[PDB]
């Protein structure tokens, strides 16, 4: 049913479709409904082959990979397939604007994060569309959610939950967010992290918010009467003839359902509270499970190349090593830059293997930190070396000139 | 005077020619050395000596597989820890250990990520307190009024060390994650429920004297976790120092004063060489350079005279090696 | 002379060091001023575009807006003001003898970056309007160089303003348009209907030459002199608004009205311009449209005018009698290239 | 707490029996107290089979 | 040593005889004397007497000089 609804939405908000475009769109919808929860790469490849078999045996067409299907309504007025390079350029310009406007963060854009942006935008454009992002730390979950919500005009509400906090503060911030969604008709993207669920009662409150479209506990008695009076005054201001309690509360529920999207950020899905959060009954059936996982080696190669291509790196001879194709993760080696990127990727994989992470997702924070440190360190070292060599050279030249002048005299 | 100027600079000319000859060799191995230095900086903060050596062997193998050159006699202390920084750290109260020197250089060269200190002995708290003087301030996650004290410290610009790191308080997350909003020439950060200004001279340290504690994944993935664990050579050196102080206090005082004078003389010689190079580059001057060369000869003679007490120290070390190993 | 339409292809291209933010035209001499994200200020001749006439870096951050004015008096030069992110507003002098830029003074007092400035002449007095991220709409006298009025009419930060007589209007980040009387410093009516922040809002001006949106409807609006307003936002739409008649005006118990809503842009609309019955607007879809006010449709589309985004464009002012409405059109883009239309 | 402050000020021995029944107090107040008179000695009686006492408190005693 | 100019920008690329490179951004790309330089993003190739040629690209966004690759 979610696949059918997605196909209808894409057709309704799309251009004149052909049979090939219809098949590709259905395949993209199948990717977004059936194969965002897959963890392993081999299961993704199996699903790709399954789509190929199903399309070939029912609808007798381009490549149907996960990244080769880029459907987005950002580049036009309608939901249609877009190219890769122009989409990357547009996302680069809009992320530069976002970093200028809200918070500065040095992030580098690759193809997989473009795909994640597209699916997060698709899930945030829906009615009753909630997300649940799973992946290793520093993969870029909350910053992507904030950027996509800024693209759609949503208002970011991040709960300020810390230690020495109880259910009172969480209920207060949830009630405030609900009031902003309904009474002030402001669209809200509430981002809930794994660490913001201190106690299982927080998870129960989130479960009640997601299963229904309101918390019955947060409006009881005198505060229920205050909500009734406030929303009656709002409806009088808006200009609708609602008088009964049932119709007015149904309007309240509909406004919350239309103007509230909850995005979950989860770092390690093996922990007990995270496993309970994943296996929650109405969190599973309502949210769109988007398993980002750890960075695959292509993404690490792309971001490493895009962050070391600006430093002065190639300055000496290089012999191309004779290495296997399975040991080369970048393009075939032509300069020392690809060798440096491959060395960093190999050391990251070997370090995470030696530390026995098991099946826990691998944080790419060490990779980015090492890349930035290497860039700044090689810049400083090259500057110091060339300055020292110039100083020694001019000193030797001055000494030789003085010796020659003394010999001539 | 010009003749003596030319004659006295024979050793300087030989050293300059040797450095010019070795410039190609040092430029060939620059990239590999930078790679290993960055790996030390961002990976081996939380590893013991055996794991550091094993992963260094793996890194050297992986670096030689792709045929990029690196220094065969590479060492982290000689490449990142300068003599002035080493002198300051040793004066402030850091141990003589090479492991502690490596971790010290890792901590104070992390200008981007917030360094997390894991020191069971609680010695780095007073080492960093001595390093920054009276402008440092000590807070903790377990005390009331921590939020307003940290906000006032950020507004003023003091250096903050937060104790009890295993009790992380998640309203300083924007301070940990370095997610600032730039407002022209002023930088502001949102802590709690109201934004505060950042003076730009404010540095953050997190200290936790509890090994095998609990570091949240948000905090664990964004800090330079540095472990200060005592090892074999630190125990041997401390045992030798304690037994020599309790055995012959005057001789121990003489040896430590001699070591301090020797390293001060080496630093003065390096600064004198740098000043001579700068003065010759910016070309009266002959008399000044003759005075500098006389000072350098005096320093070299002072080292030659001061190098006559080493065999006694070596004999005492060879005598107390059994006590140290026991 | 007023129904001119630009040709299919550009005549010549202007090369700038980095992305262009604002572009203005000299009313008398055929010379164009180009801003720069690096902070530089350029001045290119319309005929000899190989080298700039004058180029200087008075700011340290990105220039945000500029607008020029030829001074006149009843008893006479060009005044150029530059707004940047470096917390300061710089006023320049353009001498026509040796054609060089001369800095006059700097205006300080904004608490954040400044994004739009306005300059106009009234009773032989020159005033410099300004709006910034500090939520304050400030004005500084050109001669005295001291602040006159300062008010906070929006909850969020103002992005663009425009001045007609003694009245000012402003669009901000909270998708509202506020019309506030400058001498009294009080709001007259609010604006609602947009869902994305305003990028450019400007008054529409009465003409006597039949344009629907440039003619008054009643005698009271004729005495007021202002009836409609055009606003462009990040909603990919251009909306023509309507100003209710106010009662030191007193606000009538206070809402605007969307007379007409345009659409068709594939990205955020950045800058708008008016010339006769045609409305010229740029957007981030590397294209420029041309809308009729009478029909609301677009006649011509300039697809792929710039490689990257298109930031700014302007035409010659036709409502002012002191400025001859030449058929000069020039646009600025993010791809470090300025485009100018000739003949 | 009051008797610990009084015994630090004016002197006197003190013994805390079964500190494992108040582990939160031990982890916060005792840690921050031992972390920072001459005839004042404090004894703590715990159980070997009980919960894990904090290491920074344990090495300080 | 060598004098170079941009194709459509008001920038002069003057190379010193001591190996420094100046734009009127300064960077001593060559330790020894530079023979000649050429221009062609903008790609600038510098040749010196040290049997090493360094190719630098002039980024006009931040008015800095970045090295792409070098030929030895
Ligand atoms: N595509 C990317 N390029 C560069 N850095 C990235 C990228 N994605 C994430 N990061 C790093 O991750 C950090 C933000 O990650 P965040 O969204 O906070 O992770 P989480 O959601 O797990 O807390 C940034 O500091 C940034 O350096």
Author numbering:
A (entry chain A): 2623 to 2682, 2686 to 3034
B (entry chain A): 3291 to 3573, 3582 to 3624
C (entry chain C): 139 to 213, 218 to 351, 354 to 391, 397 to 402, 405 to 494
D (entry chain A): 3826 to 3861, 3868 to 3892
E (entry chain B): 159 to 182, 192 to 207, 219 to 250
What does the original paper state about this entry?
We also prepared grids with samples that were pre-incubated with Lis1 before ATP addition. Because some of our maps showed partial density for the Lis1 β-propellers, we performed 3D classifications without alignment in Relion to further resolve this compositional heterogeneity. This analysis distinguished states with no, one, or two Lis1 β-propellers bound to dynein. The nucleotide occupancies in these new maps correspond to the nucleotides observed in pre-3D classification maps. In addition, the interaction sites between Lis1 and dynein in our maps are those previously characterized and are largely the same in the bent and intermediate dynein states. We also saw clear density for the second Lis1 β-propeller in the intermediate state dynein, even though the nucleotide densities in this state are consistent with the ones in the straight linker dynein. Comparison of this state (I6, 3.4-Å resolution) with our straight linker dynein (I3, 4-Å resolution) bound to one Lis1 β-propeller showed that the sitering interactions are conserved while sitestalk is shifted away from Lis1 as dynein goes from the intermediate to the straight linker state (~15 Å), making it inaccessible for binding by the second Lis1 β-propeller. Binding of Lis1 at the second site is unlikely to happen without Lis1 bound at sitering. We next investigated the AAA3 and AAA4 contact area and showed that Lis1 binding loosens the AAA3 and AAA4 interface, potentially favoring ADP release from the AAA3 binding pocket. Notably, binding of the second Lis1 β-propeller further loosens the interface, as illustrated by comparing the population distributions of interm-2× Lis1 versus interm-1× Lis1 systems.
Cytoplasmic dynein-1 (dynein) is a highly conserved molecular motor that moves toward the microtubule minus end, transporting various cargoes including RNAs, membrane vesicles, and viruses, and plays a crucial role in cell division. Dynein belongs to the ATPase associated with various cellular activities (AAA+) family of proteins. Its heavy chain features a motor domain composed of six AAA+ modules, a long stalk, a microtubule-binding domain (MTBD) located at the end of the stalk, a buttress region that makes additional connections between the AAA5 module and the stalk, and a long tail that interacts with dynactin and an activating adapter. Lis1 is a dimer (~90 kDa) with an amino-terminal dimerization domain and carboxy-terminal β-propellers that bind to the dynein motor domain24,25. Our data support a model in which Lis1 relieves dynein autoinhibition by increasing its basal ATP hydrolysis rate and promoting conformations compatible with complex assembly and motility.
